Amino acid sequence: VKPNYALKFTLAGHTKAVSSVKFSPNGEWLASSSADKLIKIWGAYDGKFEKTISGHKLGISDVAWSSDSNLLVSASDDKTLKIWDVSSGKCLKTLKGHSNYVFCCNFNPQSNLIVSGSFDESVRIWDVKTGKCLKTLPAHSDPVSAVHFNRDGSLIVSSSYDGLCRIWDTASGQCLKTLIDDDNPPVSFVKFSPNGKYILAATLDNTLKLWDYSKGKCLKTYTGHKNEKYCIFANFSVTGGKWIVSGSEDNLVYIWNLQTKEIVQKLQGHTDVVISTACHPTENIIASAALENDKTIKLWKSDC
Ligand SMILES: CNC(=N)NCCC[C@H](N)C(=O)O
């Protein structure tokens, strides 16, 4: 088993670098955020442009869906997050509190909470209904590159340019684990596995690692791509074969066999750094997006 991802659609419309793409949990939509200050919505299967959602005053670094596919949250250089009703286009809340660029965000599975990370070195936990900041965690000593909830929402993982991945108890705000690996290269991305047993972390030394975060043991290392500057998203692909998917600074999408760590496909087509990739929740579909010199989003499909 190798996959056979092939380009199906190219989605053009952002006028500056794309920052993040994400599929809706219900599989119907792709949301994209950009340095152009906009969120765009596209059909997940046909790439058909759906709408633009606007309101942020500066570029957006991340976007994320609620569990029911009705809301988005966005993280902006304007130091706010916004909560959006996707269908109406309304900004429901503006989450204020961070003192610098907000870089990363996610809903918990219940989607009553949002987690954010910022250049202000903090992680903040927010109440979705009221927009109030519930906790400010003194999480890191450099910008926070990623934040993610585990499968039951009881944990948060954060990554930072300080070289650390930390695991937090959602309820208490307590730091439960600090993951340490040698020379402490900036951690540019992190997320939990779908099952919540592992985390996948990217570091700016051209490396992805799969950690057992409780035991604190690096289980797999994925290499061959280029990642020394940008906070590039990585993924677990679980709809067919078990893959690791990542963007890369050589303009390619990389796909590794999770177990063997071998590169199984490289997807060519983008003309600038592939900053973001996402994997469709039920079909073997990858979305990718690129930086300023490209500005397009691509939808690729495989038989496995
Ligand atoms: C968690 N978000 C993220 N990795 N976004 C992509 C990078 C956005 C950044 N503002 C940049 O242009 O490099």
* One-character DSSP codes across 28-45: SEEEEEETTS-EEEEETT
**Closest CA to ligand 1's atom 13:** 230
Cβ 47 vs Cβ 88: under 8 Å: no
The finding on whether 198 has its CB within 6 A of some atom of ligand 1 is no
| Cα distances (Å, whole numbers) of residue 57 to 136, 213, 250 | 24, 37, 31
Alpha-carbon dihedral sign for residues 225, 281, 117, 211 = negative
**Closest CA to ligand 1's atom 9:** 61
User: What's the CA-to-centroid distance between 9 and ligand 1, angstroms?
Assistant: 23
The finding on whether 278 has its CB within 6 A of some atom of ligand 1 is no
User: What's the CA-to-centroid distance between 33 and ligand 1, angstroms?
Assistant: 10
The finding on whether 17 has its CB within 6 A of some atom of ligand 1 is yes
93 sits in the region (left: phi over 0; alpha: psi -120 to 50; else beta) called beta
User: What's the CA-to-centroid distance between 5 and ligand 1, angstroms?
Assistant: 25
The finding on whether 231 has its CB within 6 A of some atom of ligand 1 is yes
For ligand 1, mutation pick of 231, 249, 272, 297 (most atoms within 8 Å of CB): 231
Cβ 238 vs Cβ 245: under 8 Å: no
Straight-line distance from the first to the last Cα atom of the chain, in angstroms, rounded to the nearest whole number: 8
Under 8 Å CB-to-CB from 182, ≥6 apart: which residues? Answer: none
Cβ 108 vs Cβ 115: under 8 Å: yes
Q: Which atom of ligand 1 is the closest one to the Cα of 231?
A: 4
Helix (H) or strand (E) holding 11: strand 6-11
Q: Please name the fold of domain 1-304.
A: Methylamine Dehydrogenase; Chain H (2.130.10)
- Beta bridge partners of residue 243, listed in sequence order: 237, 257
Cβ 230 vs Cβ 292: under 8 Å: no
Beta strands 102-107 and 113-118 are antiparallel
Cβ 218 vs Cβ 211: under 8 Å: yes
- What the block records as the tokens of 21 is 């793409």
Q: Which atom of ligand 1 is the closest one to the Cα of 146?
A: 1
For ligand 1, mutation pick of 103, 190, 272, 294 (most atoms within 8 Å of CB): 103
Under 8 Å CB-to-CB from 124, ≥6 apart: which residues? Answer: 95, 97, 98, 115, 116, 117, 118, 133, 135, 136, 137
**Closest CA to ligand 1's atom 4:** 231
3-state secondary structure of 280: coil
Residues 298 and 245: their CA atoms lie apart, in Å, by 14
- What the block records as the tokens of 261 is 């760590």
The finding on whether 103 has its CB within 6 A of some atom of ligand 1 is yes
For the stretch 70-77, contacts whose Cβ atoms lie closer than 8 Å and that sit 24 or more positions apart, written own/partner, are 71/107, 71/111, 71/128, 72/31, 72/39, 73/105, 73/106, 73/107, 73/114, 74/33, 74/39, 74/105, 75/102, 75/103, 75/104, 75/105, 75/116, 75/117, 76/37, 76/101, 76/102, 77/101, 77/102
The finding on whether 102 has its CB within 6 A of some atom of ligand 1 is no
Q: How was this structure determined?
A: X-ray
* Sheet strands (E) in 25-112: 29-34, 39-43, 49-53, 60-65, 71-76, 80-85, 91-96, 102-107
- What the block records as the tokens of 173 is 């705000």
Q: What is the DSSP string of 107-127?
A: E-TTSSEEEEEETTS-EEEEE
User: What's the CA-to-centroid distance between 209 and ligand 1, angstroms?
Assistant: 19
The finding on whether 61 has its CB within 6 A of some atom of ligand 1 is yes
- What the block records as the tokens of 36 is 């152009």
Under 8 Å CB-to-CB from 34, ≥6 apart: which residues? Answer: 14, 15, 16, 17, 18, 19, 40, 59, 60, 295
Q: Which atom of ligand 1 is the closest one to the Cα of 291?
A: 12
**Closest CA to ligand 1's atom 12:** 19
Q: What are the structural domain ranges in the chain?
A: 1-304
Main-chain dihedrals φ then ψ at residue 276, nearest 5 degrees = -145, 140
Cβ 41 vs Cβ 86: under 8 Å: yes
